[PDB]
UniProtKB/Swiss-Prot annotation:
Gene coding for it: Timd4
Main location: membrane
Protein name per UniProt: T-cell immunoglobulin and mucin domain-containing protein 4
Note: Belongs to the T-cell and airway phenotype regulator (Tapr) locus, a single chromosomal region that confers reduced T-helper type 2 responsiveness and protects against airway hyperactivity (AHR), the hallmark of human asthma.
Result of knocking out the encoding gene: Deletion mice maintained on methionine and choline-deficient diet exhibit significantly more obvious inflammation and severe lipid accumulation.
Organs and tissues of expression: Predominantly expressed in lymphoid tissues, such as spleen, lymph nodes, and Peyer patches. Also expressed in fetal liver, salivary gland, and spleen stromal cells, predominantly in the marginal zone and to a lesser extent throughout the white pulp. Not expressed in bone marrow-derived cells. Expressed mainly by antigen presenting cells (APCs) in T- and B-cell areas, but not by T- or B-lymphocytes.
One Gene Ontology term, aspect cellular component: membrane
Residues of the full protein shown: 25 to 134 of 343
Length: 110
C-alpha cells in the first residue's frame, strides 16, 4: 500500500489514475476500507466515463479530468475520522478484472 500524509484541518489528495481510460467503457469509485469483491464499500464518490455522478457529500471531489483517467480523490478539511484505508476501484468491462488499489491516509497536526 502507498501511504499519504496530510495535515488535520487541511485537504488531502489520494492518488489514483488509469492511463488507458475510456469514456465509453470505464467508470470508477472511491470507498472506505479495502477494495471488496465488487464496487466500493462505504462509497464516497463515483464517476461514469466523463463525470462525478454520485458523492457522499461536498467533502469529496475529483480535481483532475475524469475522461483522462485522473481520478485522484481530494478530501477537504480533514479530521481524525478520515484517517485509514481507502479503496480506488477502476471499473473495467467484464468480471473479476477491475483495477483495485488500497491507499492508507495518515493525518498529523502542524
Ligand atoms: Na470488471
Amino acid at each position: 500500500e502507498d501511504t499519504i500524509i496530510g495535515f488535520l484541518g487541511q485537504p488531502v489528495t489520494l492518488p489514483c489514475h488509469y492511463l488507458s481510460w475510456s469514456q465509453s467503457r470505464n467508470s470508477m469509485c472511491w470507498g472506505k476500507g479495502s477494495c471488496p469483491n465488487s464496487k466500493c464499500n462505504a462509497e464516497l464518490l463515483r464517476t461514469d466515463g466523463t463525470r462525478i455522478i454520485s458523492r457522499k457529500s461536498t467533502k469529496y471531489t475529483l480535481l483532475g479530468k475524469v475522461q483522462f483517467g485522473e481520478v485522484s480523490l481530494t478530501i477537504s478539511n480533514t479530521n481524525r475520522g478520515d484517517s485509514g484505508v481507502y479503496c480506488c476501484r477502476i471499473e473495467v468491462p467484464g468480471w473479476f478484472n477491475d483495477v483495485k488499489k488500497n491507499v492508507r491516509l495518515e493525518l498529523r497536526r502542524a
